[PDB]
Amino acid sequence: ALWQFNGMIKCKIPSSEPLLDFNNYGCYCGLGGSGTPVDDLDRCCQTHDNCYKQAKKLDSCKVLVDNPYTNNYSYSCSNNEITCSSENNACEAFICNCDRNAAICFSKVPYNKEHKNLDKKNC
């Protein structure tokens, strides 16, 4: 679930408004995403991606047949650091960790404005 993923990124990157800034970026931030990541910040996404391809291979994610893209785990934010609650069970726990490494990834790398809204031909 996305209500919570965008909350992660505003936890870490506060002046952020992530649906707005980190959408449509380089080859991977946004749905689908092909070719080679244009920058680190895009690789970030490139990775988060493989992490949701991952999850769904999971057997738990299976027989809850769960929706990553609908994953409703639970995390907490404080003093700008993230914790996905122990209460998350095998699947949405995985999913929680995907959004978590990506969200930090992002706080961690430079934001080249010129690959914001890249053209799917550069990919």
Swiss-Prot record:
EC top class, as a word: hydrolase
Which coarse location class applies to the principal site listed for this UniProt protein? secreted
In Swiss-Prot or TrEMBL terms, this protein is called Phospholipase A2
One Gene Ontology CC term in the entry: extracellular space
Cofactor(s) in the UniProt record:
Ca(2+)
Q: Please describe the post-translational modifications of this protein.
A: Activated by trypsin cleavage in the duodenum. Can also be activated by thrombin or autocatalytically.
How is this protein organized at the quaternary level?
Answer: Monomer or homodimer.
Q: Which reaction does it catalyse?
A: a 1,2-diacyl-sn-glycero-3-phosphocholine + H2O = a 1-acyl-sn-glycero-3-phosphocholine + a fatty acid + H(+); 1,2-ditetradecanoyl-sn-glycero-3-phosphocholine + H2O = 1-tetradecanoyl-sn-glycero-3-phosphocholine + tetradecanoate + H(+); 1,2-dihexadecanoyl-sn-glycero-3-phosphocholine + H2O = 1-hexadecanoyl-sn-glycero-3-phosphocholine + hexadecanoate + H(+); 1-hexadecanoyl-2-(9Z-octadecenoyl)-sn-glycero-3-phosphocholine + H2O = 1-hexadecanoyl-sn-glycero-3-phosphocholine + (9Z)-octadecenoate + H(+)
Q: Which family does it belong to?
A: Belongs to the phospholipase A2 family.
Q: What is its EC number?
A: 3.1.1.4
Note on how the cofactor is bound: Binds 1 Ca(2+) ion per subunit.
Name any one GO molecular function: phospholipid binding
An example of a Gene Ontology BP annotation on this entry? phosphatidylcholine metabolic process
Compartment(s) of residence: Secreted
Q: What does this protein do?
A: Secretory calcium-dependent phospholipase A2 that primarily targets dietary phospholipids in the intestinal tract. Hydrolyzes the ester bond of the fatty acyl group attached at sn-2 position of phospholipids (phospholipase A2 activity) with preference for phosphatidylethanolamines and phosphatidylglycerols over phosphatidylcholines. May play a role in the biosynthesis of N-acyl ethanolamines that regulate energy metabolism and inflammation in the intestinal tract.
Q: Record's superkingdom? A: Eukaryota
- Could you say which residues bind Ca(2+) here? 28, 30, 32, 49
**Per UniProt, what is the name of the gene that codes for the protein in this document?**
PLA2G1B
**Residue pairs linked by disulfide bridges in the UniProt entry:** 11-77, 27-123, 29-45, 44-105, 51-98, 61-91, 84-96
* Keyword line: Autocatalytic cleavage, Calcium, Disulfide bond, Hydrolase, Lipid metabolism, Metal-binding, Phospholipid metabolism, Pyrrolidone carboxylic acid, Secreted, Signal, Zymogen
